[PDB]
Design a protein around this ligand. Structure first.
Ligand SMILES: Cc1cc2nc3c(=O)[nH]c(=O)nc-3n(C[C@H](O)[C@H](O)[C@H](O)COP(=O)(O)OP(=O)(O)OC[C@H]3O[C@@H](n4cnc5c(N)ncnc54)[C@H](O)[C@@H]3O)c2cc1C
Length: 450
């Protein structure tokens, strides 16, 4: 029970005592520090622990692919907490109004939530703090090392973040204790049914009204995430290092949709991967992606209020892009062309079809996809929102600190360094279609997504 994993955001007087855990980001029962810590305070007060989830009004800003994935895993989650004598309540509405009412109605004693550096979470926390008098606590249940503990400021390079993270690995890379059960708001399927009816008009469709999304690639839920983790270690971890940059090969862990929704703990993945015997290069490469690059995204969003804006770019990148803002662009595409994949480049939209159909673009093509948006945009700011809009609308792992950090990496050179000067893009790292052809079978990738 490491105390550096928990932060106090509001102090007050404890009420009746029924610890309420406001699940937001980590939607799992196993390997949850916030759930464990909420249980960790329960016995000291001789009171039970409850779980509350909020179905916010912002779900209409996304698609059915993400709403279905979250709700189906929640359905499996509800059964899991019931086996541990933990009741879970699902509230629909603004968290500020619902959580404040629930705390007063249930006479809650202590409130616990999981950490998320996104702006919308800080928006919800602000309203809840002004509407409650019980103590408010938050726990970083998403990062191996707590975000405030890994670094106390913004890190502008991975080389400056890796030694800090690895130095704190021995203290925080530990095994999860078992979740002790308790000593002793109408339906979830109904709220799913009415939700999709509201998102039906905005469903992505093909020419013949055939829906574009294919939901058989990633089964949601805590159970399915474990099998994905087990399959990756047994079959794909050995060749991960050599084939990670090949979109034509399915050699990735495919863990981001579960990681984003908190359906599986990243710490659990690190634990099993570390024990696994594989190629040392592949293990190091995967550990770099899930430890350094994933958690530096939390660092980027936590220490930059404008993480989704041009203001958070490095100084060299802002001046370079500002100097090339007046450069004539080869082509300009609006949001409709980018969304429908109607660009002259056949590689770019081929990634878009993969994003539209499967809901998870390949890691290598996602770099090319976002950088071409900067090339074909009227301004870097326009490319920022165009990339953010498409990413947060169609990616299953979207609306995540990994997304905004990754977009900032591709467009603004965040966590990168200056490269050869070029028109339009300035000193931002360049990715050419010819360069892609020398790295992997572009034609095979294009044919698979037509
Ligand atoms: C422009 C752009 C936008 C992105 N938007 C998102 C997003 O909205 N949501 C999202 O989860 N990821 C995003 N990524 C980061 C990364 O591409 C994905 O995490 C990864 O592609 C997801 O598939 P995977 O888990 O099978 O990859 P794996 O090769 O299996 O990597 C394992 C884990 O490491 C993490 N990771 C891998 N690459 C990165 C990275 N470049 N930055 C941070 N963490 C990483 C992921 O959590 C990943 O699950 C984005 C990348 C780019 C270049």
């Amino acid at each position: 029970m490491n105390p550096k994993r928990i932060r106090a955001l509001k102090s007050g007087k404890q009420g009746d005592g029924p610890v309420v855990y406001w699940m937001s980001r980590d939607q799992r029962a196993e390997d949850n520090w916030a759930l464990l810590f909420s249980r960790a305070i329960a016995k000291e007060a001789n009171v039970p622990v409850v779980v509350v989830f909020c179905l916010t009004d912002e779900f209409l800003e996304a698609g059915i692919r993400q709403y279905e994935f979250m709700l189906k895993g929640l359905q499996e989650l509800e059964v899991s907490l019931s086996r541990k004598k933990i009741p879970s309540f699902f509230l629909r509405g603004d968290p500020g109004e619902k959580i404040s009412r629930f705390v007063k109605d249930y006479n809650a004693g202590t409130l616990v939530t999981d950490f998320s550096p996104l702006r919308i979470k800080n928006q919800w926390i602000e309203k809840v703090i002004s509407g409650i008098s019980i103590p408010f606590f938050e726990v970083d249940a998403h990062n191996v090392v707590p975000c405030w503990e890994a670094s106390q400021k913004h890190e502008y390079a991975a080389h400056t973040f890796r030694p800090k993270l690895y130095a704190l690995l021995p203290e925080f890379l530990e095994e999860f204790p078992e979740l002790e059960p308790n000593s002793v708001v109408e339906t979830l399927s109904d709220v799913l049914e009415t939700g999709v009816k509201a998102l039906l008009p905005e469903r992505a469709l093909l020419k013949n009204k055939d829906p574009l999304f294919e939901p058989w690639h990633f089964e949601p839920g805590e159970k399915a995430a474990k099998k994905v983790m087990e399959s990756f270690i047994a079959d794909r971890l050995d060749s991960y290092g050599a084939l990670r940059n090949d979109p034509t090969k399915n050699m990735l862990s495919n863990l981001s949709p579960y990681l984003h929704f908190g359906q599986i703990s990243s710490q659990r993945v690190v634990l099993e991967v570390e024990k696994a015997e594989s190629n040392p290069g592949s293990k190091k490469a995967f550990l770099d992606e899930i430890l350094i690059w994933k958690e530096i995204s939390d660092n980027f969003c936590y220490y930059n209020p404008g993480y989704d804006g041009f203001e958070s770019f490095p100084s060299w990148a802002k001046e370079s892009l500002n100097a090339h803002r007046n450069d004539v662009r080869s082509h300009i595409y609006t949001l409709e062309e980018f969304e429908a994949g109607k660009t002259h480049d056949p590689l770019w939209n081929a990634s878009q079809m993969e994003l539209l159909s499967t809901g998870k673009m390949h890691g290598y093509t996602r770099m090319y996809w976002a950088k071409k948006i900067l090339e074909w945009s009227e301004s870097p700011e326009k490319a920022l929102e165009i990339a953010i809009c498409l990413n947060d609308r169609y990616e299953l792992d979207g609306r995540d600190p990994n997304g905004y950090a990754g977009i900032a990496w591709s467009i603004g050179g965040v966590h990168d360094r200056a490269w050869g000067e070029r028109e339009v893009t300035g000193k931002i790292r360049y990715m050419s279609y010819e360069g892609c052809k020398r790295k992997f079978d572009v034609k095979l990738y294009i044919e698979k997504y037509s």
